[PDB]
Write a protein that binds this ligand. Structure first.
Ligand SMILES: CC(C)C[C@H](NC(=O)OCc1ccccc1)C(=O)N[C@@H](C[C@@H]1CCNC1=O)[C@@H](O)S(=O)(=O)O
Ligand SMILES: *[C@H](O)[C@H](C[C@@H]1CCNC1=O)NC(=O)[C@H](CC(C)C)NC(=O)OCc1ccccc1
Lengths: 299, 299
């Protein structure tokens, strides 16, 4: 059957993406109604040195912006900050505005990047939020403003707008409210990511995926308890397991129990000794339980 | 920077997928104009035993088809039988029909899967075609007639319809003209894939990606000439790198020559010494030169 990191379709989101430029700064904006949200660092004259955003807003001239979509130019009428984002009121309303809410993504939850280079939708991949509020995506010069979204029970949420990349390769963005995940600064300064807490829920779903695909070697007769585990987790940089009921269907279809895999995590966290689960030489927390159920049984 | 397997956006394609059933079989059709393409085995009374296709098609009533989108039912008037594909003429034309062409994918080449469960919305993800005309995607019961596509020069090409899974779990499909890739049969019989042959272009592309992400341990003070490598490849299940001029820019940007990388393949094909390259445990041929240049530079 196979296991692949998937994106939910880009259809509702593609038509919302605009080229936003100012001086030498070209990046991406989100166009809902008459509003256009994009990273504020697009104003700054020099983004390689510390920036004064009070100064930069004070000498902002609305005629200098070049907000565009396709062969439509959107004139700017108002520019305020909201957190690290810059909310522009533009002269047009997006005929293709979808029913949407804004939500903040939490450590362990999966979402979709529409990676856009300087105003063009480019590619869709699925990501997973790490404990320190970073993602391990693919982002370059020109992809700031690239938009993250989830679809839950018919509802479209926008959840992420791309800002920076940390010394260690990690990628940092903001919720559409304008708070940087992880509390990181919209500055070029050195910022350390700090130690990474693996999602116990997501590893369990991954191993359940392994089983459904035939890989069984990692499972013994040993079962660790929810209480035993959560204690072990607290000193081995691993989350406390939400609940056993999350995996009910998965436990049924395999005849293997969360407590059976919770022990697998412990034995494998010490090594694979050269073995691979679905071609990984190491445990993977990329996949939520929801993704595995969807991808293994179409639910 | 980072490297991910990506997909071109799906928003032209999403609205073309319908649900097609006949008897106990349910799968996906492509609705363009008044035409629904779909795999012919939708008509097989039992899809786990070898199928007499001329008998099963000889007793087929077109009224026994079900073809729906958003529980709006379309009515079948005619069909033509075209290779392993069925082409149903329906009473209604698809209002959301994108300007499209058709092409056939060659080994080495990348394309996008929209994976739909039983006409349902689905998930998007990039694949790459292996030497035997298979892919290693993610497919389950209910996902047949799921569609592959490339966007080249702003032109949408439909290129893949999904049919079956080999024992090894490789995935087989057809172009939209009903010719099945790698010549496989539309049957549950145990068909063997054949020897995988790795794309040399794609492995070089990949090592350039690693070079650009600061992973350098594989490069050495040794170059292998093109003819020299081509000899080695013929007897090691690798394609013949035809040119070097594809990699001109990656050569320039990185300072490393194709030949340095050609020699790295020969060494690394022996095995990684328990090291990794962008968290892979052996050479990767899933990324074309084009994909890497796009992803590292925005071109
Ligand atoms: C924090 C801001 C003041 C600017 C931010 N700085 C930044 O992310 O620092 C890394 C860097 C530095 C120079 C060149 C390339 C990358 C940034 O460049 N964001 C980029 C996206 C970065 C560039 C590389 N990968 C990314 O995610 C789009 O604006
Ligand atoms: C199409 O509905 C289905 C897609 C298969 C289901 C499992 N993964 C896929 O890609 N096609 C079939 O089931 C196909 C039927 C025709 C060839 C007549 N047979 C085949 O795909 O192998 C059956 C199989 C089912 C479950 C696991 C492994 C193989």
């Amino acid at each position: 059957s196979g296991l692949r990191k998937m994106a939910q379709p880009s259809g509702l989101v593609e038509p919302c993406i605009v080229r936003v430029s100012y001086g030498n700064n070209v990046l991406n904006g989100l166009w809902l109604g008459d509003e256009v949200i994009c990273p504020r660092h697009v104003i700054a004259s020099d983004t390689t040195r510390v920036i004064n955003y009070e100064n930069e807003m004070s000498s902002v001239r609305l005629h200098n912006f070049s907000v565009s979509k396709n062969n439509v130019f959107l004139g700017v009428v108002s520019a305020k900050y909201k957190g690290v984002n810059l909310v522009l009121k533009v002269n047009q309303v997006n005929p293709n505005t979808p029913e949407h809410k804004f939500k903040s993504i939490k450590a362990g939850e999966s979402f979709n990047i529409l990676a856009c280079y300087e105003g063009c939708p480019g590619s869709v991949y699925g990501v997973n939020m790490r404990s320190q509020g970073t993602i391990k995506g693919s982002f370059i010069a020109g992809t700031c403003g690239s938009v993250g979204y989830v679809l839950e029970n018919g509802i479209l949420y926008f959840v992420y707008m791309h800002h920076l990349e940390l010394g260690n390769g990690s990628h940092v963005g903001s919720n559409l409210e304008g708070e940087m995940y992880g509390g990181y600064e919209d500055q070029p300064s050195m910022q350390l990511e700090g130690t990474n807490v693996m999602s116990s829920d997501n590893v369990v779903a991954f191993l359940y995926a392994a089983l459904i695909n035939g890989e069984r070697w990692f499972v013994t007769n040993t079962s660790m308890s929810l209480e035993s585990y959560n204690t072990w987790a607290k000193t081995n940089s691993f989350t406390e397991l939400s609940s056993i009921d999350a995996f009910s269907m998965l436990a049924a279809k395999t005849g293997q129990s969360v407590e059976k895999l919770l022990d697998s995590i412990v034995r494998l966290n010490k090594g694979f000794g050269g073995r691979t689960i679905l071609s990984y030489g190491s445990l993977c927390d990329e996949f939520t339980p929801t993704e595995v159920i969807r991808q293994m049984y179409g639910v």
